Amino acid sequence: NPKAFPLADAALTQQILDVVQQAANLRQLKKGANEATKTLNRGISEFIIMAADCEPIEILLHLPLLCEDKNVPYVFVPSRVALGRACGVSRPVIAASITTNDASAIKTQIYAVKDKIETLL
Amino acid sequence: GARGGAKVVIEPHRHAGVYIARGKEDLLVTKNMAPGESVYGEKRISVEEPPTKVEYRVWNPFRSKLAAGIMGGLDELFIAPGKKVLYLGAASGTSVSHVSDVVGPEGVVYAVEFSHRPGRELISMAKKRPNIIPIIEDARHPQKYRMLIGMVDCVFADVAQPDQARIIALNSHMFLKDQGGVVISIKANCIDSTVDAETVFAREVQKLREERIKPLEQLTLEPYERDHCIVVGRYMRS
C-alpha cells in the first residue's frame, strides 16, 4: 500500500548495507539515482537499493518502474544517511546499484542478499 | 549479425502465420498488425509488395518462452490465424503482441494479467491492436471475468505460479472448446525447487491428466532457457 514497498527490517537492512560497503571497496557499487538509472538501461545491475526517507520519495520512484520491467530485484532501507555512510561517500545516498559481476570476490553474499530480496518481493 | 541495412529473404514457416527471414543468419518473424512501430524495441523488417510496404517484426526466443519453443521445433501449435486464444500471464505485449500477429485480424487474444503496473502497458498496447482484449484480473478466480470471454480455441498459460495447474483447469473448464488447444509453460524452480526439474515436469503432466487434458507433446527449451518445458495437450471433455 505505501509507495515505498517492500521495506527491509532492522535485521535485513544490515546485510544489505554490508554488501554495499564491500561493493564500494571493490568498485562494484554505483551511487546515486542517476547512476542506478544508467545501470538499469544497460542491464548490468544485480539489484537496486533505495532509501525510504528520500525527501521527497517520488524522485526515486522511477527505479521501481524500471526494475520489474527488467526483472531486477529491489528493496528500500529506512535511512539515506545510513545508506550514504555504507556507500563510502561523504553525502547521503537515496539510491545505489550493485553492478553485475560473476567474477567478483564477493559474489556469494550478493546472491544471498538477492535471494532474500526476491523472497521479500 | 542482423544489422539495420541488411537485406533478407522472408519465407513461410511450417506453422501458419509464422515466417522465416533468411540470410547469413535466419530470423523467425511475424507480420506486424500495427506497422511502423516496435512494441519492446524489436527489429522490424519492411518488404515492398505491389507498392505497399508491408512490415514484419523479429521474434526473440530469449524473450518469449513460446519463441524458444518453436525454435526447438514443436510439432503442433494450436495458435493459428483466425482462432480464439486465451493468454494467461500476459505480463506485457512482449509475447502477446506476437501471438496477436499470428491470429491475425479475424482472431482475438484474451490477455489476462494480475499485477497492476505491467497491466498498464498491456492496456496501452491493446490500443494499437484491436484484436487483444486485456483482462487485468487474477487468473485464480475465472468466475470474475467469465463475462468477458466466450469459447476459446486454445488456452496458453505462461503463469509462473506453484498452483499453475489449478488455474489452467479452471480456465480450461470454462472457456476452452472440446478438443481445444492447451499449451503450458512450466518452470520447476517456481513450482518445486527442492526436487529436480524432471520430477516436477512429470508431476505437472500428471495433474493435467487428472483434469481431462490429454498431453500431446513436450519439449525442453534449452539452450535459450533453463529448467523449462512447454507441454502441449488437448482438452478431452468426454
Added chain:
Amino acid sequence: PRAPRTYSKTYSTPKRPYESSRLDAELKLAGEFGLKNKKEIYRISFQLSKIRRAARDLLTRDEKDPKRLFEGNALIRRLVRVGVLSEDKKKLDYVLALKVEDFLERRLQTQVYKLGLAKSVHHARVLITQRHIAVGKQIVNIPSFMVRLDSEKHIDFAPTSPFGGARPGRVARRNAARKAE
C-alpha cells in the same frame, strides 16, 4: 608384547565396478571435483554407506526408543556440524536422502574454489598441497580436509604464504636478484 593398535580400511571396492553408467558417474565426480583417482570416490561412498546403514538401522527401531533417540540425535548433530545436512532437515529420514556430492562439496578443495581463492579446482589442489591455505590460524595441506560451518568463514591465505603477506617465494626473489645484478 605391546597391545595392538587397531586399523581399518576406509574404502571398499564396489559390487560391480564395470557398469557403464557407474563409470560415467565417477567420470563426473572426478572431473567436477578434480579427484586424483577412483579410490577417493570409493572412500566417500563407503563413509556415506556406513552413515546411511546406521540411519536405516536406527529407523527400524521403534520411536521413542532411548537408543533411537540418543544415537539418531548424535548422528544428526554430526551431519549438521560437517554441513552435509541442512538445519531445517533434522530428521533421520533425510539422512537416507544424502548423496556423495554433498560430502564432496565440503572438501577443502571445493570450498577453496568456491570462495574465489583459486580459479580452478586443480588450482585449489595445488594451492592446498603447497601450504598456501590456512583454516583459522593453522595451515592445512590436505585436499580431503572436511570443512565445518564455523571453519568455513576462516579459510584464508596462510601468513607464511607469499600470497598471504610473507616474503616472495624462491622464484620471485631469484628473478629479482638476477635483474638487479
Added chain:
Amino acid sequence: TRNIPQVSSALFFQYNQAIKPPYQVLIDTNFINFSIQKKVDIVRGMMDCLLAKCNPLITDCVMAELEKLGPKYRIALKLARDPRIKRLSCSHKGTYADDCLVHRVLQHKCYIVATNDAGLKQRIRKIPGIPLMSVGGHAYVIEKLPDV
C-alpha cells in the same frame, strides 16, 4: 515433418544425473508375487535395497490388470491398495501394462522400474538411464543405479 526425439536433459551418456533420493518407482504387476512369494515387503525391501526412502507408484493399467486376476490373487490386490502406495492416472486407451510402463519411462527420466519380466526388462535396458529394479533370491536388486 521429420521427428528426431530429443534425448532427456537428465542424461550424461549413460548416467542419469536426475534420479536421486527419495526415489519414485513404478510397480509392475508381476513384482507383487515375487514380493509376496519371497515374503519381501514392498516399501522396505526397496529401502534395504536402495538405502533410501522409496515412493511406490501403481498406474491404472497395472492396477487394471490386478482386479482382472480374480480371487486367487486377492492378497496382491490388497497390498496394491495400501495407502502408502500412491496411484497414477492414465490417459491412454490400452490396458496393457508393459506398454504403459515403457512409455512413461520414455516420457520422463525419473522412475525406477520394478519388474521381473524378461521381455519388459530388455525393453527398459535398451532405454538409457532407466534404473531397473527386480526381486531375486531373498530381496530386491537394483542394476543401473550406481548410487548404491
Added chain:
Amino acid sequence: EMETMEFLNIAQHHGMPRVLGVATHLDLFKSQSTLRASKKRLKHRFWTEV
C-alpha cells in the same frame, strides 16, 4: 662402475659362481640419512644382477 658389471655379465654367461657384494668408502658420507638411501639403492640394484 662399468668394470663391476662387465665382470658380472661375464660371470653370468660363463656360469655364475658365488658373488658377495662388499661396499667401501662409506665413511666418506657426511649424513646418516643419505648413507642409508645409498645403501638401499645399491643393495636393490645389486640384488638384480645376482
Added chain:
Amino acid sequence: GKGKPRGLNSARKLRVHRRNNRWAENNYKKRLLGTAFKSSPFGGSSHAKGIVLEKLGIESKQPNSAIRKCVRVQLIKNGKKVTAFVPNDGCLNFVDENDEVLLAGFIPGVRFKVVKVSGVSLLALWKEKKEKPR
C-alpha cells in the same frame, strides 16, 4: 509329513542323518579325505619345476606359430613328460636344452606355460631387465 522327523526332541536323528548324508557330496569327501589335489595338474602345487627335453616347433616354417611356442618338458617331481607354452619365439631363444623351467597353469591339450627359466622371469628377460645366469 515331509519324510523327516519333526518332533521338538528329534535333533539327534536329524544330526546323525545329516552327518551320514553329508559324505555324499564329492566336495565334502575330497576336503575331509584330503584327495582334492589329485585332480590338480601339479598335484597340489601352484608351480612345477621341469627339464626342457626338446623344442618341438623349432623347425616350423611359419614364424610365431602355435607349434613354434611348444616345448616338451619333463616334470622333475614325477618324471612325467609334458608340453608347455612360451610367450613368443623371441622368448623361445632364451630357452635351451637342459635348463630349469618353472611351469604354471594356462593347440588343445597343452595346459602349461613357462614363467621362469634358470630362476629368472621369462618376462624379465623379454623386457630385457635381467640376464639369464648359466
Added chain:
Amino acid sequence: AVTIRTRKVISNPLLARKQFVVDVLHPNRANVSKDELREKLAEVYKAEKDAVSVFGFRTQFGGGK
C-alpha cells in the same frame, strides 16, 4: 617477538617444584632453543637458571608455535 605462556600450572612441594605446559609463540622464527626458554622462564618466575628444566618441545605443523 617471542612470547611464553605457562598453562596447567601445578605446585608440587612433594618434589619441591612447579610443573606446567609451556606454549611458545615465535612468529617469523624457526623455534626457540631450550636455553632461551630457560632464561626467560627463570626471569619470569624469579629463580636461578639451573633450577629451570624444559623438555618435550614440539612445533605444530605449519610452524609459529
Added chain:
Amino acid sequence: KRAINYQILKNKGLTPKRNKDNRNSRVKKRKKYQKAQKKLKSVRAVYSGGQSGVYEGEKTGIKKGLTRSVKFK
C-alpha cells in the same frame, strides 16, 4: 672413472612409449572430462550463458521440417 649411465642405473629395459598424462592421473582425468563436455555440446544443445548482447539471430539456421520434441503415444 667410468660411471654407469642412466640406462644402466634405472634398468628400465624395453618398455612401450607412454604419454606424459599417465604420470599424473589428475591431469589425465581433467582432460578426459573436458573432452567429454565438448562431445556433449555436439550430442545436445546445452545452455551457454543465454543471451549476451543484442539478439543476432540463430547462427546455425532453422529447419522447418524437423521436430526435436518427444511425443506422447
Added chain:
RNA sequence: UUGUAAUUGGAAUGAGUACAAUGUAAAUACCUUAACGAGGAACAAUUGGAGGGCAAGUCUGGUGCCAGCAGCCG
C-alpha cells in the same frame, strides 16, 4: 572453435642438499627453518589389455592381379 607443441612469460612448491634449533639415554627420523634445490620442470610412474599401418622383404595355398600366416630381417 576443436585438437596438437623438445614454442614461449613469470609466479608457487617439495623430493633432495644443508647452517642452526627441536626431538632423543645418545643418535636417526618427524614438525620447524637460514641458504641452495624446476621447462624435456632429463628432478625422465608403472603394471596389464585391445587395435592398426607400412617394403623392390619372407613362407604357405590356389578357378589369373588373390587369400592365410605373419613381417626388429628391405
